[PDB]
Amino acid sequence: AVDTAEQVYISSLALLKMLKHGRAGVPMEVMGLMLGEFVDDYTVRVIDVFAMPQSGTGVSVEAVDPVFQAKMLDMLKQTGRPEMVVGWYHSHPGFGCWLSGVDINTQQSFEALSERAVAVVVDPIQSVKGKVVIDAFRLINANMMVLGHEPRQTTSNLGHLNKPSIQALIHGLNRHYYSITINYRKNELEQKMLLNLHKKSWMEGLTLQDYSEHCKHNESVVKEMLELAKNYNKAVEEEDKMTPEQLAIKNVGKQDPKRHLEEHVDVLMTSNIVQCLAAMLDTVVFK
Template sequence: MDSTIAQKTWELENNILAVEAPDPSSDFIFYYDEVAQAMSLKAKPWANDPHFFKRVKISALALLKMVIHARSGGTIEVMGLMIGKTDGDAIIVMDAFALPVEGTETRVNAQADAYEYMVDYSQTNKQAGRLENVVGWYHSHPGYGCWLSGIDVSTQMLNQQFQEPFLAVVIDPTRTVSSGKVDIGAFRTYPEGYKPTDDPISEYQTIPLNKIEDFGVHCKQYYALNISYFKSSLDCHLLDLLWNKYWVNTLSSSPLLGNGDYVAGQLSDLAEKLEQAENHLTHSRIGPLGTSRKKIPGRITSWLSKTSFSTRLDSQNRCLVRLSAKDEMITA
């Protein structure tokens, strides 16, 4: 598979729509209307309706930038900002840039130098003729899904108080590499003390056992927005140039090693969940079947633990063979 075919496949899997028309008005989405944006900021329709924003439109260029940045962090969380505008009940993300922040495997926080960089970047962007404003922030959740933790909720609430309109985007680079489709979510928080009248049905996703409590405590404090992607003739050239970097990183990385660690982690997490369920059944002892119920999950847990370990070793051995073959091909 060459670079062009891989790019087309990536666009199809993520349902990126091309803005096409017989005249130059097809690129109208890139036009920034200062008067309309100023009127929207003055009216502040989102202040009276917590559900005002329902859609997010992300350019393919911004999406690829965020994915490359998230993948570069590996198992460490990364953070960046998004630039764009609003259009009715939609937030349009035109571009994105990374922030120089120090993250861990569970959290990422911006310090003073990151805020200074953000201001300098925004000012330079406007001097270059890009009048769009910062409309949100993005960060990665390597391997544990797209949702907002307690710290994320607090950060987003603070930004919505002082920088509206503002959006939070979460990308899982590990699941993105595993599936080939970008695992992404866009969220906005409710005002403090607000309780939604209806509970929207969210898309099912597996949450690791050590994150379930954090997910469950704060899942009612925000809602997800529908995401769509677009590209146009104006950004096709830049998208092609950026794709070359993404494609090289894809070739130089080893999906077997990455997927092996991810699968082993999923099996280990499943084993812990089954063990927890086994303990609940042991303590409950419902009826005469309590003893027989206790034995089955224990066997499954033991098998999963062994499988998790063997999967990790097997994937690493295969990766070493693959990398050796790749080195021989390059040096030949």
């Protein structure tokens, strides 16, 4: 009985507790616990995340408070749901993700206690634009050290979700743990009530943004579009057989032809239509 290509399920609230606790203590490598359920042999799920108070030692086994462990679990049994811990996490701000020296020491305690106890490393400050730098890892033994680690077998969902990155494979990764796959438990009864309630405005759709700010904009764009038409005349009346596909590449200027064309005309079209349709509907509805 040995590993395969596993799968990690995370709940929607679990990821939100990760990025919020990471954004809170952005300099000093925050630490917390991960509470879920072992559903089968080789897929792990997590429903809940609660953090840890800050220890002066740092991210290690000494940052784990056993009296804050059991008494926090004492409350969650009688309210909500009791379940077994399945792992832990921390935050590593200075890089993306790889298990460091004091990372790997406290992992050995957890895999001695649990079956797997999957680690999770998240950089809070790297994740900015629309994506999150989250990855989960899991330590390997020394029994197959001259053999091929990660004993994976009959599947084809292993080549996805990441290739081993060179900022991560220069450290441990390969001959010390392995990487694991993470998707999201995307659910209904949460997805639309997060979408429609976060981005919404009722009366904005039929406002006017006035005329004194709007006729000035219609005044402005036509004036350079006149000179854009004069520059459009210049290339059309030119029309010389100087190998015109080579004549165009020696006359590149990030300019006219068709790019600096009707793009403005489309904006002039859409602005006045939405302005006039809002004007005509408002005369219709109100008295």
